[PDB]
């Protein structure tokens, strides 16, 4: 019942645990970045560019998250969609955490104003040798914290840690993320499937037959609903809230899927498992995949357990 | 040389003679659209969840209703959220009929997916005293029509005889900034939009069209698939990037789902004033004369060439 | 009755009079600049000046950016011909493409000299009409305040409020920073006939002529054995004048030695607040004549001003009438 | 390199080890201030005037209250708006005592004058059970104090033993941005501030001192009068531009009007830390042992040389 905010949640789960403060401040700083990304995505100031005072979003998001993570004095390696190679933090500002993020996911189609988001996934540095790109190559199992911000009909940050998955709604009136769902867990089975079917020609037989099973029920029930926005963050958030399954399977145009492991697949897979769901690559679990490159693509099928398991059974049959 | 909706709306009105009522209708309407935005972005949510201690469908409809009522430019008012028509009280009557969906796609509003307002303004056909028949005009007679997208940012799209204009809201000052003038649509796209969870129930014409897209017949490249589940969001994508949108008829919806007067007709008028088309398969959406204010209709809108590619497949199976 | 926004009220009243629509157009563009000023004064985006994104239009002083906003909104309205401002020594003649009927005199950000202490500041405006038959010039701004089509201010205080005086009367609108509309909160307001506040800079006590020095003692030591008036001086005209509109009372900025002909500017401070006051049942006097009756010879002309509640202003006037 | 208050209030804590409770207090306090600013600037005023169909003292108090109880860092809470010391429920208790005025100057708020939230943080010293007594500490024992000014913009002024620090609220992101660091006051000023309507009732000492500033002794230049009527507003001017602020004993209030624990004592700590001075004419405001939570006190604060000059005149007449 009693109120609580994202700032207080992270400075109290971090308070009530050892207390180095770096991860508290990293997350602290990270929401402040997201709040700034939100106002820019809501186009708050477009009038000054169009002549109110008189005579980039994907780039600006990357700058904000980087800048802030750097100033947090808690990051040593930083991997992003935009920056090809990793970003080794200047000595002065280094901490002990490796952060992998997609600063604006879906801005390929931001000109139609579709829901976009910010995906993040925090690792701690295991190695002793001087920081490097290779420190980002940890398996998804090793995620200290992951989550995503959604810039949709409203802004929401979904934080996943060992203590569970907690969903915060940005009240733009006060500039504060408000806790509106505690320790969320996904439905066991849903009525929704999320898939780009223009690649129907190029599907695995198992993916094809699972969709046929959903479209044309094999147990004389009701067919599922198709819901594909075109931005992972939105579809996954629906898959959390409403239940169901999300699929970006391996094609032939993309033999390894399209969604990147380190900063797209793994963070969403962590959120799913920490909330009673599951995510798999078909053959191995997304979190158990060991990266060899930081921009490594991966197939990913995440969502409600009784559905992903149904998929997985069909994967047995077609392998 | 900044050009706001409120400025646009009274120069296009002055550039079209006439009283000034429609300007003040669109002013009141967009003021309500600004207040829907505020609630949809969840401003004040902390007070509900107990920052001091201790519904959107309805709120959105109340905002639109009170604003259009107070505008002195409405006689009949038709909404999703009202089974009957709203005969505006005589002291506040105007010369226009507004058919609107206050918040479209709110069924799945809890996933925080793009919702929107849809509207379409007619001019009274009445001679004496208004009635719900004034809303029962074909889409061809639409004075003005458009929508507002509460997505990545809030955009009002306004189609009129002078064309389709897109205004971005600037939340900092609450002004709609003209960012796209007289918009026209790609002649053909690589996007298709429908709910394939009804594939069991689709017409043979529909099914073949999708096979043509999933499996190009001319050995080109397969089209793309996008169904947000919200008409504003899908229509606006079909406007911006191009492509095709369908919510066709099937056996368990012989008349589609999407309503005529406050969903299909408004989006058809946008598309046709932007160079796209909009058909039910047999008539064009704007050419259906309604019999019921909550009448349902099939809709296949989008880029011109794409709807033509459909209509050829449709005629073959009929 | 029902909700109303500044936007309809302006374009409603501008249709109840047929009318060109320029005044409506002007009042809108002026409004839109006012919301813009408010958002900058509330320091929105101050974080992008302090390294939020790392590196970089508006590294401007707020009083300048305000002026630029009001200017580039007014010119673009196609309703203005001559524009007078405090931040401009000469009147701005609008280009022949965007010329209109009305002459506007304004103070973009009044009180910004102490905006460091975050004091209430505001935008004072006043709309005349070109009465001249010849091309626009700084002469056209030299009209008496009697010839005001409309006047008012926007107070950027605990909240942002636009006060609009016309022949209608005075109409108070509050900005809802959520939706970005001015909401009609008070309609056709009038001032309290008499009040219990007095407002002036008593640091200039050494240079007060006897009329002021007596009246002030009549308030601190009342003659009728009643109760002393309260002393209230923000140091920002929009602030003190607005309090005098809501609570009643009196506001004085008179003749000194340092500035013997007043300080407060006539065309874009005194005259507009006099129109507000007179249209709301109050008075505004120079001591000699009434403020609205003063005949300008220069655009940046100063003037002594004593405005406020009717009984209060007249009480002072009897005291000045003893000394002349 | 940006510095927010959520960073600063944690950095200082980490540097002093400490549980994390003074941090959470202030972090929770600031969210309350962010919410009060929203209310004061009239966000949602449209809905009170019927945009969709059809108190601030109390809301501000409820906000501070509920946020501080939720902080898990308070045991005793003292406010204007409750004639009682509020003792926090055992499950939500910390070790600090907060004496606060949630909205000061809202007396004269219909004219929209600058208002503000004043606060001061003590630490429970009695081994006893949390009670009103724990708040009756002299201001000297203060861990932290300050105020939130809701004027031109919103600023949180935060005084501690690491100096006084000013934080500007950026409504675009809801973040208090550090803009003036380790601030310090001019040793002498040119501005004076008091209600001269109470002239008939002032100390002969006060009356001389004002003469001494209105008509200078060294026939130099006079000071400038500035009385807003909101202590936060006047005091913040006196922090920035310098000068003096008085609310001395007249007769209707012969022991001052301004409340010691939650009006005078917090402002004294700010001045003190920023190199200023704050006296009752007898003793330092921080050195007044309180008897009642709502106890009033004569307050004279500002630039040190100017406060001393008043004190010189006081000693003559005393
Ligand atoms: C609910 C989990 C949680 C949440 C927050 N929070 O802020 O909500 C936290 N904040 C902080 C902080 O002190 O900054 C911590 C530190 C604890 C920690 O995880 N150490 S470790 O990297 O796994 C490690 C690497 C090698 C040996 S132990 C923390 C933990
Ligand atoms: C570009 C199209 C356009 C746009 C706007 N706008 O505001 O962007 C308009 N505003 C208004 C207004 O009246 O203010 C108009 C007049 C509309 C109207 O009168 N239609 S009619 O009753 O069938 C009729 C009466 C007499 C002859 S035709 C208008 C038109
Ligand atoms: C209630 C007072 C009031 C308020 C507003 N308002 O919008 O707050 C106005 N807006 C406009 C406009 O047309 O812009 C007007 C008319 C301006 C005008 O035409 N003056 S005139 O040539 O001597 C004349 C001809 C015919 C009648 S008066 C107007 C008037
Ligand atoms: C003034 C510097 C400063 C600022 C903040 N801050 O929040 O910016 C702090 N936060 C916390 C925390 O507990 O997290 C501390 C330590 C706890 C504490 O000060 N205990 S004390 O007996 O009152 C005491 C007074 C002096 C030495 S120790 C802290 C300290
Ligand atoms: O258009 P496709 O091939 O279905 O790709 C969809 C996927 O691409 C993405 O948009 C990748 O995001 P961006 O390329 O815009 O950064 C996913 O969010 C989304 O799930
Ligand atoms: O789930 P379905 O059957 O595909 O329906 C989706 C369609 O219905 C709508 O959601 C209509 O809005 P509501 O369902 O929220 O009333 C369209 O926006 C949308 O395109
Ligand atoms: O210094 P003084 O004599 O108090 O002058 C105060 C007057 O100067 C002004 O501040 C003039 O405005 P500026 O601060 O922009 O110069 C008036 O608003 C105000 O009433
Ligand atoms: O009417 P007065 O005596 O000048 O009172 C002014 C003083 O009273 C106060 O308003 C007391 O606070 P309140 O407004 O909450 O009663 C101070 O803020 C202010 O400095």
Q: DSSP states of chain D as a string?
A: ---BHHHHHHHHHHHT---SHHHHHHHHHHHHHHHHHHHHTTTTHHHHTTTT---HHHHHHHHHHHHHHTTT-EEEEEETTEEEEEEPPGGGEEEEEEEEEEEESGGGTTTT--EEEEEEEEE---SS-S-GGGG---GGG-SEEEEEEESSSEEEEEEETTEEEEEEEETTTTEEEEEEEEE---SS-SEEE--GGGGGGS-HHHHHHHHHHHS-SSS----EE-B-S-HHHHHHHHHHT--EEEE---SSSBTBSSBIIIIIHHHHHHHHHTT-EEE-SSSBGGGPPPSSTT-B--EEEESHHHHHHHHHHHHHH-
Helix (H, G, I), strand (E, B), or coil: what is residue C145? helix
Distance CA(A232)–CA(A234), nearest Å, equals 6
Chain C, window 265-324: residues with a beta carbon less than 8 angstroms from a chain D beta carbon: none
From the CB of C112, is ligand 7 less than 6 Å away?
A: yes
Alpha carbon distances (Å) from A119 to A28, A89, A150, A265: 15, 20, 9, 10
Judge if the beta carbon of residue C241 lies within 6 A of ligand 3.
Answer: no
Q: Give yes or no: residues D190 and D298 share one domain.
A: yes
| C2 catalytically annotated | no
**DSSP for C170-234?**
EEEEEEETTTTEEEEEEEEE---SS-SEEE--GGGGGG--HHHHHHHHHHHS-TTS--PPEE-B-
Q: Which of B166, B182, B198 is the last residue of a domain?
A: B182
How does DSSP classify residue C48?
G
Q: Please give the distance of CA B19 from its chain centroid, rounded to a whole number.
A: 26
Pick from B116, B228, B42: which is nearest to A154 by CA? B42
Among protein residues, the one with the nearest Cα to ligand 2's atom 27 is: B18
Residue A269 CA to residue B176 CA, distance in Å, equals: 39
Is D170 an 8 Å CB contact of chain B?
no
Ligand 3 atom nearest residue C18's Cα: 26
Q: Do residue B228 and residue B252 come from a single domain?
A: yes
From chain B, pick out residues whose CB is under 8 angstroms from the CB of A52.
2, 170, 173, 175, 177
Q: How many residues belong to chain C?
A: 324
Distance CA C168, CA C17 (A): 12
For residue C14, give Cα distances in angstroms to C28, C31, C168, C169, C276: 12, 15, 11, 15, 19
The count of C-alpha atoms lying within 13 angstroms of the C-alpha of B237, restricted to the half-sphere facing its C-beta, is 30
Residues of chain A contacting residue B200, judged by C-beta atoms under 8 Å apart = 215-216, 223
Structural domain for D207, as ranges: 183-317
Chain C interface mutation, best of A34, A54, A56, A61, highest count of C Cβ atoms under 10 Å: A54
CB contacts of C47 in chain A (<8 Å) are 36
Tell me, yes or no, whether A170 and A275 share the same domain.
no
Helical axes D56-69 vs D21-40, angle rounded to 10°? 160
3-state SS record for B105-160: CHHHCCCCCCEEEEEEEEECCCCCCCCHHHHCCCHHHCCEEEEEEECCCEEEEEEE
Q: Rounded to whole angstroms, how far apart are CA atoms B227 and B231?
A: 9
Which DSSP category does C239 fall into?
A: H
Q: Is A45 in Cβ contact with C36 (below 8 Å)?
A: no
- Find out whether the beta carbon of B75 lies less than 6 Å from any atom of ligand 2: no
Judgement on whether residues C247 and C302 belong to the same structural domain of the protein: yes
Are B269 and B216 in contact by the 8 Å Cβ rule? The answer is no
Sign of CA dihedral B114, B120, B121, B124: negative
Quote the ligand 4 centre to D158 CA distance (angstroms).
13
Give nearest CA residue, ligand 5 atom 6. A230
- Going by C-alpha positions, the residue among C182, C12, C11 that lies closest to residue B92 is C12
| H-helix segments, chain B | 5-14, 21-40, 45-48, 56-70, 204-214, 231-240, 265-272, 304-316
Q: Tell whether A188 and A176 lie within a shared domain.
A: no
Catalytic residue among C110, C140, C240, C278: C110
Inter-chain contact D6–A176, Cβ cutoff 8 Å?
Answer: no
Give yes or no for a contact between A5 and A177, defined as CB atoms under 8 angstroms apart.
Answer: yes
Question: Is there an atom of ligand 7 within 6 Å of C66 CB?
Answer: no
Distance from A78 to chain D by nearest Cα, in Å?
Answer: 18
Q: Which of A4, A5, A12 to mutate to test the interface with D (most CBs of D within 10 A)?
A: A12
Final residue before a domain boundary, out of C147, C165, C188: C188
**Residue B195 sits in the same domain as residue B307:** yes
Ligand 3 atom with the shortest distance to the CA of C79: 14
Q: Do C254 and C168 share a domain, yes or no?
A: no
D43 in reach of chain A (CB within 8 A): yes
CA distance B251 to A228: 24
Q: Taking CB atoms and an 8 Å cut-off, how many pairs form between chains A and D?
A: 79
B108 lines ligand 6 (CB under 6 A): no
**D36 and D7 assigned to the same domain:** yes
Do D85 and D210 belong to one domain? no
Q: Neighbours of C (≥3 Cβ pairs closer than 8 A)?
A: A, B, D
Backbone dihedral angles phi then psi of residue A229, each to the nearest 5 degrees: -80, -35
Q: Closest Cα to atom 13, ligand 6: which residue? A: B105
Q: Do D209 and D145 sit in the same domain of this protein? A: no
Q: Which residues of C are annotated as a binding site for substrate?
A: 110-113, 201-204, 232-237, 253, 263-265
Residue closest to D118 by CA, chosen among D252, D237, D268, D2: D268
Q: Which of D222, D224, D243 to mutate to test the pocket of ligand 7 (most atoms within 8 A of CB)?
A: D224
Between chains, do D35 and B44 touch, taking CB under 8 Å as contact?
Answer: no
What SS3 class is residue C3?
Answer: coil
Contact (Cβ atoms closer than 8 angstroms) between residue B68 and residue B92: no
Tell me if residue C107 is catalytic.
Answer: yes
The answer to whether D189 is a known ligand-binding residue is: no
The residues pairing with B96 across neighbouring beta strands, listed in sequence order, are: B74, B123
- Picking from A52, A153, A167, A247 by the largest number of B CB atoms within 10 A of its own CB, the best residue to mutate is A153
Tokens representing A149 are 């911000």
Last residue of a domain, one of B182, B215, B249: B182
Q: Number of folded domains in chain B?
A: 2
Say if residues A192 and A222 touch (Cβ distance below 8 Å): no
Q: Which of C123, C109, C112 is nearest to C27 (CA)?
A: C123
Q: What is the DSSP secondary structure assignment for residue A285, as one 8-state letter?
A: B
CA angle D132, D137, D142 (to 5 degrees): 120
Q: From C37, which residue of chain D is nearest by alpha-carbon distance?
A: D152
- Residues in chain D, overall count: 318
**What is the B284 CA–ligand 6 centroid distance (Å)?**
21
- Considering the domain architecture, whether residues A303 and A157 belong to the same structural domain is answered as no
Q: Which two tokens stand for residue A206?
A: 């198992």
- Residue D251 and residue D177 share a domain: no
Structural biology method used:
X-ray
Q: What whole-number distance in Å separates Cα of residue D89 and Cα of residue D65?
A: 12
Tell how far CA B77 is from the center of its chain: 16
What's the rounded Cα separation, in Å, for the pair A248 and A250?
7
Q: Which of B195, B200, B208 is nearest to B247 (CA)?
A: B195
Q: How far apart are CA C109 and CA C234, in angstroms?
A: 15
């Amino acid at each position: 019942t009693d109120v609580n905010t994202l700032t207080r949640f992270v400075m109290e789960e971090g308070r009530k645990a050892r207390g180095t403060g770096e991860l508290t401040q990293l997350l602290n700083s990270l929401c402040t970045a997201v709040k700034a990304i939100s106002s820019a995505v809501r186009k708050a100031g477009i009038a000054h560019l169009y002549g109110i005072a008189g005579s980039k979003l994907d780039v600006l998001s990357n700058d904000l998250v980087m800048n802030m993570l750097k100033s947090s004095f808690a990051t040593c390696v930083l991997v992003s969609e935009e920056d090809k190679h990793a970003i080794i933090v200047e000595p002065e500002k280094r901490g002990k955490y490796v952060v992998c993020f997609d600063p604006l996911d879906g801005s390929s189609n931001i000109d139609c104003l579709v829901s976009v988001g910010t995906i993040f996934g925090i690792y701690r540095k295991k190695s002793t040798d001087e920081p490097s790109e290779k420190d980002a190559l940890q398996p998804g199992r090793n995620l200290v914290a992951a989550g995503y911000a959604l810039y949709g009909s409203a802004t929401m940050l979904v934080l996943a840690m060992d203590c569970g998955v907690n969903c915060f709604m940005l009240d733009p009136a006060i500039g504060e993320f408000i806790l509106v769902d505690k320790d969320v867990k996904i439905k066991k089975k849903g009525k929704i499937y999320s898939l780009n079917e223009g690649y129907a020609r190029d599907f695995d037989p198992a993916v094809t037959e699972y969709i046929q099973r959903k479209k044309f029920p094999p147990d004389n029930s009701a067919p599922y609903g198709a819901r594909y926005v075109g931005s992972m963050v939105a579809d996954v958030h629906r898959t959390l809230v409403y239940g169901g399954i999300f699929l970006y399977p391996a094609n032939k145009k993309s033999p390894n899927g399209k969604l990147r492991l380190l900063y797209e697949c793994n963070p969403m897979a962590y959120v799913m498992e920490k909330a009673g769901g599951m995510a798999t690559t078909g053959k191995e679990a997304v979190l158990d995949v060991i990266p060899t490159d930081i921009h490594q693509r991966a197939p990913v099928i995440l969502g409600s357990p009784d559905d992903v398991l149904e998929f997985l059974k069909v994967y047995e049959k077609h392998s």
